[PDB]
Amino acid sequence: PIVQQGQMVHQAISPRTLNAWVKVVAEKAFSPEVIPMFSALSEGATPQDLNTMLNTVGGHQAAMQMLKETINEEAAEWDRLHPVHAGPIAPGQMREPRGSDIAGTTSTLQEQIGWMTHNPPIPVGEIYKRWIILGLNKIVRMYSPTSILDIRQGPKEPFRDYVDRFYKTLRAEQASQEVKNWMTETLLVQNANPDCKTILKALGPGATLEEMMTACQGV
Amino acid sequence: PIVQQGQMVHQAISPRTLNAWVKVVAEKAFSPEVIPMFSALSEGATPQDLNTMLNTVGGHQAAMQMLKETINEEAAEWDRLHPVHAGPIAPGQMREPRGSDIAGTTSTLQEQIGWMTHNPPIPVGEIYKRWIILGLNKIVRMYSPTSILDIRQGPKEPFRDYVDRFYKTLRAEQASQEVKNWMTETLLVQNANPDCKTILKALGPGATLEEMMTACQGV
Amino acid sequence: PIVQQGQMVHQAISPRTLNAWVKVVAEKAFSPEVIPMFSALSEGATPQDLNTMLNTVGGHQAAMQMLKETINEEAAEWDRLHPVHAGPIAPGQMREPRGSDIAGTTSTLQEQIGWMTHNPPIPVGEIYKRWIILGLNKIVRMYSPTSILDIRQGPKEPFRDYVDRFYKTLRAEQASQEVKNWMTETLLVQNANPDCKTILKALGPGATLEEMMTACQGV
Amino acid sequence: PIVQQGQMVHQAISPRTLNAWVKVVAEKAFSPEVIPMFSALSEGATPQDLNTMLNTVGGHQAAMQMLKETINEEAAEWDRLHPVHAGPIAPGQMREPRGSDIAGTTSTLQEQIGWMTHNPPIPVGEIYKRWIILGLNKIVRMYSPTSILDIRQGPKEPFRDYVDRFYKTLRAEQASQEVKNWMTETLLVQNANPDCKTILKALGPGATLEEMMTACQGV
Amino acid sequence: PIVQQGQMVHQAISPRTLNAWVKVVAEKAFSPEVIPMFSALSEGATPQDLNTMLNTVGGHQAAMQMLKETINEEAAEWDRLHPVHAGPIAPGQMREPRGSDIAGTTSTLQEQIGWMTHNPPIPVGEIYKRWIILGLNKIVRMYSPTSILDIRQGPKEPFRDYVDRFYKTLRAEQASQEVKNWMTETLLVQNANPDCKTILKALGPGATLEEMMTACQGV
Amino acid sequence: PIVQQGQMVHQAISPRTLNAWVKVVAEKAFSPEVIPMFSALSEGATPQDLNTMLNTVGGHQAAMQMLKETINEEAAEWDRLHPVHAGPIAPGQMREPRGSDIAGTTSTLQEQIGWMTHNPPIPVGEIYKRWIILGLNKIVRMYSPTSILDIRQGPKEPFRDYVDRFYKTLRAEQASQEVKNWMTETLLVQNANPDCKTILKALGPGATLEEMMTACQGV
Ligand SMILES: [Cl-]
Ligand SMILES: [Cl-]
Ligand SMILES: [Cl-]
Ligand SMILES: [Cl-]
Ligand SMILES: [Cl-]
Ligand SMILES: [Cl-]
Ligand SMILES: [Cl-]
Ligand SMILES: [Cl-]
Ligand SMILES: [Cl-]
Ligand SMILES: [Cl-]
Ligand SMILES: [Cl-]
Ligand SMILES: [Cl-]
Ligand SMILES: [Cl-]
Ligand SMILES: [Cl-]
Ligand SMILES: [Cl-]
Ligand SMILES: [Cl-]
Ligand SMILES: [Cl-]
Ligand SMILES: [Cl-]
Ligand SMILES: [Cl-]
Ligand SMILES: [Cl-]
Ligand SMILES: [Cl-]
Ligand SMILES: [Cl-]
Ligand SMILES: [Cl-]
Ligand SMILES: [Cl-]
Ligand SMILES: [Cl-]
Ligand SMILES: [Cl-]
Ligand SMILES: [Cl-]
Ligand SMILES: [Cl-]
Ligand SMILES: [Cl-]
Ligand SMILES: [Cl-]
Ligand SMILES: [Cl-]
Ligand SMILES: [Cl-]
Ligand SMILES: [Cl-]
Ligand SMILES: [Cl-]
Ligand SMILES: [Cl-]
Ligand SMILES: [Cl-]
């Protein structure tokens, strides 16, 4: 990656960053929290470091292939929006990146460093990471085994566990924020057990989650 | 985070900081000592690092949602107290942060660095951490299974263990310091077993905890 | 290795880089993901560091000997393409590297540093790593126990597992990218079980992997 | 903490310093060797780092409360010896610390850094650590289960084990150095078993511990 | 060791370098791969660091004594080839090292640093490491339990395992490279089982190891 | 410790140096290899760091007390050889250290840094470490359970194991180097089993250990 005196300098990906990413992939598969962890382990990463993290994953090659196809889609869109201009690269300049250059497959490390350190900067690492996180979200949604409509509180289930399952599945839903606002507004109280449901209905339409869980505590 | 020559510089969150936070969350849930540990693992953290630490938590999504609602409350209050002034941002200045900018959801990393390194500084990281610690305290209080009024010394319980339970629950109470002074002043001696209670009454109203535990040692 | 102020400086290979490489070799043998991991653990490595990583491998001496022979082939080709010019090395210059100099067996550490830090640079470390990765690919292909033509979906096998095996073996194939495009275009749908095969045929010749796996999900 | 070019600079407490302190507290309770370890893990620590180390301790809240009371005693004494002078803080100066400022509860991190880096320095971190180590010594003495007068050599106990127990308990005694000189001068030879006691009496009043243990070796 | 701005600076040997060397010695005894690992863990090491690594080895004191005798032989030879010149050391110079000075037993750390940082340099660390690696090779050869003449393929043994044993023992042989070329040229095909031996004879005298192992794959 | 631009700077003792020293003390007691490890973990250490390493040792308080007495002996001798001169310390100078100042009990950290960084330097850390290593050698010799005169080869014992035990005990002897030369010259061949003893007698008085162990290999 590249780390900030003021100047930005490049260093290799660390052994325990590699081992941490491999470990979390091997242990957690494609649970939603893997996406921030990835984004955490790839701060300021070049496309070479991102390809390094993706390639060190053994197994799950169906999901990794889907990730390849998503990356290729975003690269093709970048090529459509950024048409290349023919002409020799002048002294004191650098060529404009293509879709495959941001993906790190047709660009050297020195070119990526040059794009990322220029003023103004061309952040190929954050663009590539954006595409990767897009594909990862597609995979997390695709591998989720539950739907938010099926989360229903059991007759003896404590309210805290029901809310845990509900917002876990809701985190795996990854629909828009307004759709999630509606899901929280309707399904959570709607799909509670009769007692807790009655009490939550008695709370009112503008109750917070803290008040809702406090109301059904001893229940 | 940002680390201090004199100049403050930015670096990525470390792999063992991430793994340490994930580990302590997975092992200790929401015991009070998790709050300082968090504050320890996020020294000089940007809002991006704080969101990184919060998002890498799998499970406990009810508590994390309550934390989201608390953060949104504090952000709305910040917006109420700091009304934004319309006008183009002049060369040599930066826009004033909104509530969602301090929360890191509507501000880039460069903007957070700029606010945090300016003279005078706008410490968005410590404000956001303040809100987060507020919500975490709400969660710790909400998930505490015991009340300080129910802590009573057993007939054969050593005094040290009773004081341990008492001040553990008292730490989970998180009422004001004067209320805790009164709780220590009344309940501790009041709820001891008859023998130790008699001896502590014989000590006097101004005895220290060291003297109280010394008095009921062999007892 | 050599790490980037701007100037490139040299430091020793780290203990946990060594232990990480030894560990991944001992645990994963010659699975394809070992090649990027290697390339990850040897960023900016000198030929001395690469020889260090190769020599610390105990066992697998057949594969390591094959790697030696591949390295010698690439070195002989480098000598054929780069004939050495006789003459004394002038003050302010350095000799041009031979095949064995890039392989680190006839060149000192100071010579490798000098080649790698000169302007223009002679990247002996990346050339040697290129040869090493070539031989490693030969070994990975040679030790693969399965062929892509034998990957067939079971009558009760979920489609995701079948695609996992398919693209794992395909990753071990390491034929050209167009040949792999044809393999994906023909064998994947061709070798599915009758039900999923019928549905995929109904999808159309231009369906993505995401659409194909979505179609055979409940199936 | 603050680490030494010449200038003293501040950095956050490290994850493995935190985990090391938490681990040693969880494993060793309040054995005497915990006090140097603490002092080792808090070299150059600010009051914020010391409060961080104390607050991350879960359980043992009786001892931690006693530590709070000791710290408050030392702070009150500091306030008695250092009366505050009223007046506005002049440009180029900083206010003088109170007892609670050294304890880190009423002083910001910037104020602690300013006191610790000024010439002449006001070492609030070493003063606070001094108070903390005082309270920790009180706790170690209070939780010691044995008294030095009860350490007596068994009829078949090797002399080395007896001396081990003796100086362990003596380390837990923490009386003045002259009192410990007398304890070593009298009890050690006095409380040995009859044979070893006779031989040590035959050694003479000025024998070293090496000579004493050599004399009762084969015995 | 000493690590490279440009200037070479000295630092202490790291705890995990020590623990790594102790661990690999305790686990792998004197397998050939211990020699590169050693050379890896002692890059740029002073004679003091090398003596540190050798002295921390508990047990195997026969091999360590043999290593002492080899080091003394090489030191005596260095003294024979480099006779010392009598005379006072002039201001701006340093004495020439003896055999025991390179071995670190009669030279201080400052003298070793001075020799290693001078221009032109006297690399006492690499000379001492050269002697140490010589003795280590003698020990590895002496503790090898097998001879290359006894490696014979079993009637049901896969060819890959036979080549593994063959080149393992060959690595333990450590004869000259031409002798090893002859051993590979004769014994490998000569000592294979009848079927594989017939096929390898049918391959021809100029076949690579890759072709030889490919020929006897299904066999 | 203090680490070398050129200038020597001070930093705190590291958590894994502490944990490494505590671990090796807990696992290996007082085997000879603990002394170099100690000397390895305390390179450039101040007297405060050395006292830190000694004080963190729990248990073995008999040996630690003997170490205290040895340190006090060496300090008293230093005071006898270096009489203190009365007079005020002039501006631009520092007081000369006493025995207890080198031991770190009557000198602050700043005084130790000042002595260690002055030109010419007063290396109080290496003097204190010298005394500590002296006492540690006394303890290692005192706790050795075997004498070199009792090491005798068994009738079926391989020669390598016998030499291992012999030089282990010899390392624990710690007599002068000429006495050890005589012990190797006489006892090793003298105390071998009859067969190996006959063969070694047939070797001659000037045989190396390599030749001696080679002679009794198959025997
Ligand atoms: Cl995996
Ligand atoms: Cl370009
Ligand atoms: Cl662009
Ligand atoms: Cl963009
Ligand atoms: Cl509940
Ligand atoms: Cl569920
Ligand atoms: Cl969790
Ligand atoms: Cl702005
Ligand atoms: Cl503001
Ligand atoms: Cl503010
Ligand atoms: Cl008690
Ligand atoms: Cl309780
Ligand atoms: Cl292996
Ligand atoms: Cl040259
Ligand atoms: Cl060239
Ligand atoms: Cl090239
Ligand atoms: Cl499926
Ligand atoms: Cl398969
Ligand atoms: Cl604890
Ligand atoms: Cl002030
Ligand atoms: Cl003051
Ligand atoms: Cl003071
Ligand atoms: Cl004894
Ligand atoms: Cl006891
Ligand atoms: Cl060992
Ligand atoms: Cl000299
Ligand atoms: Cl020389
Ligand atoms: Cl030389
Ligand atoms: Cl085979
Ligand atoms: Cl074998
Ligand atoms: Cl111990
Ligand atoms: Cl002074
Ligand atoms: Cl002196
Ligand atoms: Cl001296
Ligand atoms: Cl033997
Ligand atoms: Cl023995």
Author numbering:
A (entry chain A), B (entry chain A), C (entry chain A), D (entry chain A), E (entry chain A), F (entry chain A): 1 to 4, 7 to 221
Question: What's the paper's own text on this?
Answer:
One interaction is significantly more frequent at the pentameric interface than at the hexameric interface: a hydrogen bond (H-bond) between the E28 of helix 1 (H1) in one CANTD and the K30′ in helix 1′ (H1′) of the neighboring CANTD. This interaction is present in 86.7% of pentameric interfaces compared to 24.2% hexamer interfaces. A similar trend is seen in 20 subnanometer cryo-ET structures from intact virions, showing closer proximity of E28 to K30′ Cα in pentamers than in hexamers. This interaction is at the bottom of a pocket between CA residues from neighboring N-terminal domains (CANTDs). MD studies performed with WT and E28A CA dimers have identified a possible mechanism through which the E28∼K30′ interaction affects the global dynamics of CA during assembly. Loss of the E28∼K30′ interaction revealed changes in flexibility at residue positions proximal to E28 and K30′ (residues 59 to 61) and, interestingly, at a remote region (residues 201 to 209) as well. The latter changes suggest that the E28A mutation at the interpentamer interface allosterically affects the interactions between the H1 and H1′ helices. Our results suggest that E28A affects neither the formation of the Dsym and the TOD nor their polymerization, as we observed tubes in vitro. However, we showed that E28A affects the incorporation of pentamers. We thus propose that proper pentamer formation in the CA lattice requires specific flexibility of the H10/H11 loop at the free end of the CACTD. Moreover, we propose that the E28∼K30′ H-bond between the adjacent monomers in the pentameric dimer is the key to this flexibility.
